[PDB]
Write a protein that binds this ligand. Sequence first.
Ligand code: SF4
Ligand code: SF4
Ligand code: SF4
Ligand code: FCO
Ligand SMILES: [Ca+2]
Ligand SMILES: [Ca+2]
Ligand SMILES: [Ca+2]
Ligand SMILES: [Cl-]
Ligand code: NI
Ligand SMILES: [S]
Lengths: 489, 279
Amino acid sequence: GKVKISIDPLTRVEGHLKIEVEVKDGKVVDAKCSGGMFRGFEQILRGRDPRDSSQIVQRICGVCPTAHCTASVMAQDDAFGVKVTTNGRITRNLIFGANYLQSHILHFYHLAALDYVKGPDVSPFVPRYANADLLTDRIKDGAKADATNTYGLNQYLKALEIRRICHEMVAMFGGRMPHVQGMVVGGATEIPTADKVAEYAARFKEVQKFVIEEYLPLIYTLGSVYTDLFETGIGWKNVIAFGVFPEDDDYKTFLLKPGVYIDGKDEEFDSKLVKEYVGHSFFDHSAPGGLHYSVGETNPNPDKPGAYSFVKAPRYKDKPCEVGPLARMWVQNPELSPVGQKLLKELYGIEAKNFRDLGDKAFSIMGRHVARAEETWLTAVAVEKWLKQVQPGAETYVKSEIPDAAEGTGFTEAPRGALLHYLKIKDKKIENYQIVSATLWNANPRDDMGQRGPIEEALIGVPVPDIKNPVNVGRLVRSYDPXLGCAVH
Amino acid sequence: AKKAPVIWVQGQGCTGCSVSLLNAVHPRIKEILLDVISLEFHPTVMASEGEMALAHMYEIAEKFNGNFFLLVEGAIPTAKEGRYCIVGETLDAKGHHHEVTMMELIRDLAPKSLATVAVGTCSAYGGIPAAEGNVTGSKSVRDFFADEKIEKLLVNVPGCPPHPDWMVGTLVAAWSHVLNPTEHPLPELDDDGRPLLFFGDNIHENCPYLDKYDNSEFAETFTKPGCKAELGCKGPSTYADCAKRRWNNGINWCVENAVCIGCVEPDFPDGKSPFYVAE
Ligand code: SF4
Ligand code: SF4
Ligand code: SF4
Ligand code: FCO
Ligand SMILES: [Ca+2]
Ligand SMILES: [Ca+2]
Ligand SMILES: [Ca+2]
Ligand SMILES: [Cl-]
Ligand code: NI
Ligand SMILES: [S]
């Protein structure tokens, strides 16, 4: 009684994604995730001035270029042997933090929300699934359905301007966005002035107001209508985080700390235990067993028998692990926003102080959206603090020279999850450059041992009561905020 | 009255051209989508997915044959029979599945279009995906049209990403021409098919640091005063109106902040590299 559903393109994600599911007895029973576009940045980078990498890598993705730039300049800082100043560190955090806000807002509204909100009857809001299970379908009181849908749609429209203001914030010290100019090996290229700090702050307060007063309330309200969506899209329940937004000059402390949670147990993150498999990916490895990124290889092969994706398969201690706001928020376990504490009580009858108080509900379609909204608020609190810490006039740049021979690794968290860039230099040129990106951890295919990637595994059990309108498949996938440009590079 | 129909397709792109478009002002993106264009297909933002999305795209390309703009973001990879970019799957009338490559998609849609607009340096000129070291046979729209012997009006709007003003301005000028060709002639293009309206000015000739350049006052590092030439600035060899227009609603621009990397030019990135070595 199995039925196959194939969705290509899976739209309202970044980049080129195909999802295939098998459905039996009203639920997904198997799944395959495929990235269908490859550029090969790791090949393109070879032989270049290593400093060029922080411009080239941003073109992996125009949604999260600041994450790649951050990882690249940190890898360069490490390889070149240069220490960034206090003001350089803070300025880099302000550039990048502004895009965290942009990316999460862009995601929830402009990628995710059309699975819940009925837009106007003009393209690109139509056509849509005939039975889309939207707010206007779910809420049986018609006036309430209309009012809640309009509330959501007006936020979607307002968010177009809020995300644009976030890019004004990125450009303030970043030069422009997409694709900043302001982060380089040795720090940042423009010292913040008192006037520009104030101009960033004024814009930031408008974004922050939207986050607290509109975005958080919408998410908790949405979850209170779709309570079933906290009970599916579960997956492996293994998460990893690398640390993001260093809060001191020796990179020992972060806004969101590194860590791993596997099979119900917390452990420290050890980068030695990351490796990539390619058994079901369009790549050749020179040796079996999966490769640590420091000896990673990028030899594309679209003819490889049995392969189905351009995404490699990263594993931690041979376990699939997911990444992103759910991962970071689970690992750090921060206190919830005042809005979240209040609305969880009022709308759900849940007493919750810290993220982990959500329990099982965290590992679900709606849990991923909640984690992302809460993290947006948490990041805003941090940006508010950094705006007080930044010192007008204080040097943000330290000179360096390209080394003959060196290696460096930059670790961070992109808005979608754990990110590292590994850089090896020989004869003052890029000898190897290896990128292990966020969506790479989420949207990967099976490894050599047949273990499904996190999105593949989380699809198992997702209800599909209507095969012609399989709305929960896309809802699950989009809850991960996938970026296939990043996943494949 | 009537909006410009747009089918926006992505090949080897990063979505940055789309994101830059979302940053438009005067008009902003809400007004663009509701009043200026009918964005019929766009993989990043459209409601429908899979079969429904593709069927809608092909329906519009038929109903609006010779009367829609094909917007292309990203390069077209030709190696391995186009298999480095699969843009969707079409389910025939018998249940069998067929993947569609970027090559196949562009070959199909370009002859149906009123005009093709290659937005971004990737689609216009090849850009980063076509740079040295790539193995995907990555190609620009103009080169793919030449190889395919496709004669279709083509306008390039380069930049990595292009400024939203360049994309909106070019599309509005094209649509105005279609609606009244003698009142609104097509924008004059340079030898690389990009509008002189936006790409006629040399950055360096129009740069506010030119007085410093002339006095040999060069910034020793990024955070010192002076012209940026010694830090790698490619303004001397780059043609765009960034010095006047600036970026992100006039907030900053590359040269004030750091250096121009020549992102609009047909030889970006290789002819502009290394970025932090002077020209
Ligand atoms: S031109 Fe630049 S910003 Fe646009 S798709 Fe290409 S890499 Fe991305
Ligand atoms: S080299 Fe660059 S900074 Fe100097 S005057 Fe020319 S465009 Fe301006
Ligand atoms: S200043 Fe140079 S690098 Fe910046 S957008 Fe203009 S052409 Fe591109
Ligand atoms: N966020 C983001 Fe992009 C992804 N996945 C990166 O890194
Ligand atoms: Ca194949
Ligand atoms: Ca990689
Ligand atoms: Ca032909
Ligand atoms: Cl702008
Ligand atoms: Ni991305
Ligand atoms: S980012």
